[PDB]
Amino acid sequence: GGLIYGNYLHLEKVLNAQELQSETKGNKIHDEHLFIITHQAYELWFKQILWELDSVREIFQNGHVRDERNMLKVVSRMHRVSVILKLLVQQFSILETMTALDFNDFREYLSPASGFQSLQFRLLENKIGVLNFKGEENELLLKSEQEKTLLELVEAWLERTPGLEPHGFNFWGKLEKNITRGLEEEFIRIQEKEEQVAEFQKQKEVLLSLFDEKRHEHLLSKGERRLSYRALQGALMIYFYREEPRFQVPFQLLTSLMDIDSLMTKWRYNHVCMVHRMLGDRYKVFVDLFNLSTYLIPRHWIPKMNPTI
Amino acid sequence: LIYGNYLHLEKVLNAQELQSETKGNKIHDEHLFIITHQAYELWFKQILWELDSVREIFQNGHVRDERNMLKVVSRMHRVSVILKLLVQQFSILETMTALDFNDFREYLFQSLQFRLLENKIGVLQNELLLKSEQEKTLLELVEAWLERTPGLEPHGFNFWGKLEKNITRGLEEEFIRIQAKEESEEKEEQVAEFQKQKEVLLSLFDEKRHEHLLSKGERRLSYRALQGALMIYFYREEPRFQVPFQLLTSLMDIDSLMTKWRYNHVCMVHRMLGSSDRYKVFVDLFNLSTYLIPRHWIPKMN
Amino acid sequence: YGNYLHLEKVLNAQELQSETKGNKIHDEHLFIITHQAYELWFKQILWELDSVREIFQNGHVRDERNMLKVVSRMHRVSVILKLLVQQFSILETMTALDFNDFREYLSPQSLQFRLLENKIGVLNFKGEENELLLKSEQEKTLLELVEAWLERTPGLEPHGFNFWGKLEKNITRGLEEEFIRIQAKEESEEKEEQVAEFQKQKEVLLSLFDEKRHEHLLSKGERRLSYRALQGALMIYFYREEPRFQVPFQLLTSLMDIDSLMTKWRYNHVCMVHRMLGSYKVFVDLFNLSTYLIPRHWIPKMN
Amino acid sequence: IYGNYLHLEKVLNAQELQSETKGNKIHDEHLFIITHQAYELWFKQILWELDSVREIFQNGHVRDERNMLKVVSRMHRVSVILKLLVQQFSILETMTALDFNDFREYLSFQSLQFRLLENKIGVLGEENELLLKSEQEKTLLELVEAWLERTPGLEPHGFNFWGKLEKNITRGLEEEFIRQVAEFQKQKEVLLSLFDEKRHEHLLSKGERRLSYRALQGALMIYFYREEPRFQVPFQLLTSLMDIDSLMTKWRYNHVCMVHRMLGRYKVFVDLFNLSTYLIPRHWIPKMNPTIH
């Protein structure tokens, strides 16, 4: 029981929005209908993604994120985004059921300008923090480019991560100390040989490269990085101490952001592949989080947890 | 033209009205509910569009030009593909907590389009629905086409005759093979298998039984259609039957997908609101597949 | 690479009975590989499962630092089960008629799958195999291990939050307020319908507090968790936003997913058998708990 | 029977976590073993299906045309298996890079079977012997090329499809010339490039294309006249080969992506994709003589 299905879902608009340009020009093509529905579906789902995303963005801005009671809702909604993105990557299968030769039979009645022109997808990219002729649309796109990105909102939250406090756990200090010492112990172990020595020097460069705030700041300006040095510390804190209750769900959030990044990538790849199939990365907003995962500090070196709290 | 205008996004993306918000207390998860079901409908529309197109290719009689069989299989396959995506789409709503659902259940369901689909395929069973119940179902249109299958001609290949002959003879040969099992333990077990198999195998030739079961609802194709089907199944390697076989396989897939969709839709209702069925339009085709005639018994084509 | 993965065994495990008997199904190979794959994945599921079971038995579960590992590994099980449900697609690429062409060389069953069912807590083979199956029937099921953990859920303490007391109080009061709302507008068709819903809901809502009913149904098999466990669950369900309950909630959701996937797997496995040869949730309580539709306003406040 | 039939005695006793063997048993390694053990099982099936199609070409049975259904069926099956494999990446995405590092100590890893597959399809000691056979024996691309060259209607003394095509395209372009101006000249260049055997031969040598000029004609014949019974299933075969190409690509992409995730565009059937791109208007497609097949 409920209000009339069609009326509630406003199917009067949804199911009366299908206008085959083939039919309008006289020469009706069967496969065009699929093209309309497919892209109409993508948009419906984009709308939901933006809806979920914008909601999490507020939970950061409105500062509710500070109440760690809200972290479950955050992870849930972000996860949902990845799930939707997966379905969208699968949905490419539907259009793969259309022959290039059949496509050409209606390509003639398609404008080249808006070949992408998914305002919603641009909005999504902007909103997440990735890297057009419109009016009121261009106004919305403006809001997108102007307002605070998820990357931005998460950066702040990451910077406020507990344990970074120097007069507290001094995590970064302890890390720099223990890594420097352990490398030295390795150097003493070294003192095949030439190959081993190379590994050491290479590892050393990488391992010590964090703690070169200057390098980070440069690369941040150069675009190679996007998070603050402090944020990087927040992240690693969460990564290393994820088993710690107050970090368990936060870790999940980070993992989810990385999934969303890769799915987004996959979607673009499939979208490109399809365009070449029909008519013959700097996009990783959370690059830093992937990189943080790569940093191969041995377990023995990870600063041990005091009675803490 | 231009993306939004071409896709008429002005309607599709302005169709989301959370009854929660309208009544004052907006809930976040309702939006998902609207979009999810709005998506199902979009896809139903495409399925009906593809289906109706195949139905015509039968009615208009173009199906007689076997040049059209590729288009038919292609479009029918597409239906199954779309149905698969729909069965996967259930994952999206599984991302909604029953407890969150209850928070909007108080505010705010059968898809006319889905009923139309069921009718159009031939599920036993403003009023567009009427046209659906009245017009020729795919089952009906396929039945006719199956009845006109080549080789069924009695004064020709007399496939059915040859089959009844070869099966009867082979069973007898098996009976002789069994008869000298020296009253063993295995023998009695073997004899049971034989009798069971015999009953099933020879059941196929009891037009009366079929006609009864047809009336009872247990079967849905004509006796002649059953013969058309088996002809295609046994001789599918034969060029003129290769694609036709694909069509039959596809109809069976669509049946099972349709079933899966209903199962998930029921499962979800019990999951949210907290408390094969004669729904296999192509039952006969599944059954035909089961018939375990040895290959050497299948009437030879020469 | 081959040595590390011991492919020397994994490959050279494929013997088409058709070929051995002199014929050749040329599709039997798929049958072997498909089922060989299912088994590989079952092994991993049992491996992950047994690991979670220990984290309960060894009592490490008490350290809520370990809850992440638990949810992670349990989630992984569901992911693997999904892949297994998708893997049915591979065998759907085999014609019944082609199957029959090698079914002749086959006999009428995964120990591993039985082991899984037992281990999770679902209600013949060689000796040593039967020994493993014995361990399965004997050892403590995940359902059992989670029951205990659920019973120790915080807030159930009567001298503490007295959650159940507060709940019975608040539900009784709210229903009464609804009863007062009833006869608020002149007895109508809509009113009569609403009044029915109320009576129905009341019966259900108040049934929750009938320990006797539970105990009976527990004996009858209709339920599987302890009354106390049911309380632990609801505590977690209602107060899942609460930090110490966030991940625990996830664990419960995961157990329910695993149940439904397991169901789906059996359905597809049955469907396939009928397709080829012709012609109950361990965590029922958790699903049921989800159904109980208490309004938010009624949930005992956490202050 | 059961375990014995599936020889699970080998399959389920092939699990040695190097971590455990060296003393430091790591839980996630088991998944690594099973995951890759599964990939290999499926590769074996893909090779099995592939080799089978390859023979049906070599043994010349493909000529019968009754065998085309089996061919498409088995090739389709390959794509299905490849899809499952692309989905299987999800399982390993359930492993944290941080957990991986905790057993990366036991690292050395490329699948002989996958290389064998690539060779067999036609990607440009005793193990090395098998790999040799792979590089030596006739690739599917090769076997399909031959079959494509024998496509009906390419016969110049027959339908002279290519001739008719060149004629009809040239005429229609002229009509357009009599009738954006840049677009025309550009399109013309591309459209007429198809008839430059020299260009093809060069690009074939350069590697940019892989099918024979004649094969290209066979393909287009099938593409344009796919509605024709006797081309219907052949068209399916071509579509399937293209799918297999893209799936293979996807698998490599995910495999690379995973390696970068954990440790920190040339298709065998390029020609077939390209053929699809060449967008001849319907009105131009040479009409089928009363001698249709």
Ligand SMILES: C[C@](N)(Cc1c[nH]c2ccccc12)C(=O)O
């Ligand atoms: C009170 C707090 N939620 C603390 C906080 C910030 N970032 C975190 C990351 C992981 C764990 C905790 C935090 C806040 O400052 O918002």
Ligand SMILES: C[C@](N)(Cc1c[nH]c2ccccc12)C(=O)O
């Ligand atoms: C000319 C025809 N299409 C012949 C026909 C009918 N049913 C078939 C099944 C399989 C193969 C061919 C047929 C017709 O009579 O429609």
Ligand SMILES: C[C@](N)(Cc1c[nH]c2ccccc12)C(=O)O
């Ligand atoms: C310390 C504890 N892990 C407490 C506990 C038990 N069940 C729970 C459910 C949700 C949250 C916490 C618990 C234990 O008693 O083992």
Ligand SMILES: C[C@](N)(Cc1c[nH]c2ccccc12)C(=O)O
């Ligand atoms: C008899 C044949 N199968 C002819 C042939 C070759 N390629 C084709 C493509 C489509 C249709 C037919 C063909 C043969 O040469 O084996």
